[PDB]
């Protein structure tokens, strides 16, 4: 079975760290932060890593029953599985698959159904993934809502993410921090079973980021979100499970209608992409172009510079 990547343009693909489409390709230096996302992590032969799961509609969603914290508009969600089964903390994962992998204030809607009559309700809610109340590995997540009365106990409750917010009274774009991992156990202990941090280890090379713009719901948030692999690539590698004939796959970004190669990149076996470039650069590409696997190369392959 020969290795390959999907024939899908950037705009046809989805961010693997938030349920939104991809927008563009971006490269830049990543020496000043730790690049260790847990969503969108998958080896080229189809091994899912970190908290990565297969569908993008499950990224940053929560399910369970909620308990009101008395004297506040906050609720503690006792996490259920995506199945509505009880939560099991003994799985060899950092957190439930699809848990957010950045520190920030994720705003969305908390919906609930009353089992006996089918009555429903929905309220604005925000989860602060950097707080010690965010302990999804321990099976609990705190939501701040607009209500102190409406959500009932022991009823199926779901959080649908929409976007991120920022306190406009502080430095604009100071949050969220997409490269700061949450503490999945509410700051009680180390994160466990993480996908490793990635970094370009070839001179002149930088990471190639698949970038989207998270919706902003309030303030002046940093809405950039970079994933290391499109979700469709994760889905494709999982389905294909093609063996890696080396550590490094050579990809060419190709206009299928003019046949022209605009740049080449390295798809690393462990699941991330590097390009030969120095500095921050938004890649200007024909929207119909796609990535094409050309060959497996050795560790000392020099990429053509990416102008």
């Amino acid at each position, epitope marked *: 079975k020969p290795f390959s990547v999907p024939v899908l343009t950037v705009e046809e693909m989805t961010n693997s760290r938030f349920p939104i489409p991809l927008e563009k390709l971006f490269t830049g230096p990543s020496s000043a932060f730790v690049v260790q996302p847990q969503n969108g992590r998958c080896t080229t032969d189809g091994v*899912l890593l970190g908290t990565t*799961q*297969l569908s993008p509609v499950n990224i940053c969603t929560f399910r369970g029953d909620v308990t009101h914290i008395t004297g506040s508009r906050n609720y503690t969600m006792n996490l259920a*599985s*995506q*199945n509505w*089964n*009880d*939560y*099991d*903390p*003994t*799985e*060899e994962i950092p957190a439930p*698959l699809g848990t957010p992998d950045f520190v920030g204030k994720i705003q969305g809607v908390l919906t609930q159904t009353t089992r006996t009559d089918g009555s429903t309700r929905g309220h604005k809610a925000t989860v602060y993934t950097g707080s010690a109340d965010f302990a999804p590995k321990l099976g609990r997540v705190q939501f701040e809502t607009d209500t102190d009365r409406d959500f009932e106990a022991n009823q199926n409750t779901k959080f649908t993410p929409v976007g991120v917010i920022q306190d406009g009274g502080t430095t604009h774009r100071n949050e969220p921090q997409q490269w700061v991992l949450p503490s999945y156990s509410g700051r009680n*202990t180390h994160n*466990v079973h993480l996908a490793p941090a990635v970094a370009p280890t070839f001179p002149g090379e930088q990471l190639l980021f698949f970038r989207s713009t998270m919706p902003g719901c309030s303030g002046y948030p940093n809405m950039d979100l970079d994933c290391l692999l499109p979700q469709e690539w994760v889905q494709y590698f999982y389905q294909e499970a093609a063996p890696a004939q080396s550590d490094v796959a050579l990809l060419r970004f190709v206009n299928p209608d003019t046949g022209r190669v605009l740049f080449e990149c390295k798809l690393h076996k462990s699941g991330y992409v590097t390009v030969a470039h120095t500095g921050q650069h938004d890649l200007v590409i024909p929207p119909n172009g796609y990535f094409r696997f050309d060959s497996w190369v050795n560790q000392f392959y020099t990429l053509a510079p990416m102008g």
Partner: antibody
């Protein structure tokens, strides 16, 4: 939620066999480890073995290996426990139980932990 | 097999007083994931057993706050802060680390007078 309903009481001669059922009602338990536990009149609780129905993976305590087989329906999780070559010491109440968390998730140690749904029990009397 | 050892085997309790049950394992029940694979079960008279504590110290759903589990490695304790009449029965600890799962002998809790 789901309840485990077991078959009625049994009276067997030694050397015979008995098959006790554990029906899943009001739900499915097929993705959970289902254990069979028995209580002899003089003893406490003893784990005989178990099955994860959707995997058809069984585990049997050494004491019962070769004389007990546990099977189960892949969709409902309803299970059967068949104990053969019965002896007087097999006179006991037999329970089926379900772990509190399933053993499958989408994407030396067996099953999970915390058996929180139990059948009502089945008395098996073995005597000549 | 892991040998589970409970103490005492017979526990008359005064309603309103606390109670404590000890359980020792022949080897450590502490997994690499940081959890102790120890459950507590209660079999009330004439009933099926029911789960009280799982993974050492986690209360099962619906278990009142007066029950608590603690301990680590080979030494565990079930605590009842205030015994009530409805708490009588036989309490079992059980390791879930290795197959076969093995129980303690059971601690029979009855009313002191």
């Amino acid at each position: 939620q789901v309840q485990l309903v077991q078959s009625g009481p049994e009276v067997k001669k030694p050397g015979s066999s008995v098959k006790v059922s554990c029906k899943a009602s009001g739900g499915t338990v097929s993705s959970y480890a289902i254990s069979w536990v028995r209580q002899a009149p003089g003893q406490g609780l003893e784990w005989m073995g178990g099955i994860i129905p959707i995997f058809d993976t069984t585990n049997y305590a050494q004491k019962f290996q070769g004389r007990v087989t546990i099977t189960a329906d892949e969709s409902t999780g309803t299970s059967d426990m068949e104990l053969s070559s019965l002896r007087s010491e097999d006179t006991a109440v037999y329970y089926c139980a379900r772990d509190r968390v399933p053993s499958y998730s989408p994407s030396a140690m067996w099953g999970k932990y915390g058996m929180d749904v139990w059948g009502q029990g089945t008395l098996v009397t073995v005597s000549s | 097999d892991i040998v589970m050892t409970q103490s005492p085997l017979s526990l008359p309790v005064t309603p309103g007083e606390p109670a404590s049950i000890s359980c020792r394992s022949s080897q450590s029940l502490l997994h690499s994931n940081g959890y102790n694979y120890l459950d507590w079960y209660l079999q009330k008279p004439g009933q099926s057993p029911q789960l009280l504590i799982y993974l050492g110290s986690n209360r099962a759903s619906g278990v009142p706050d007066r029950f608590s589990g603690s301990g680590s490695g080979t030494d565990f304790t079930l605590k009842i802060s205030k015994v009530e009449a409805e708490d009588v029965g036989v309490y079992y600890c059980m390791q879930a680390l290795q197959t076969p799962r093995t129980f303690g002998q059971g601690t029979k809790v009855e009313i002191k007078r």
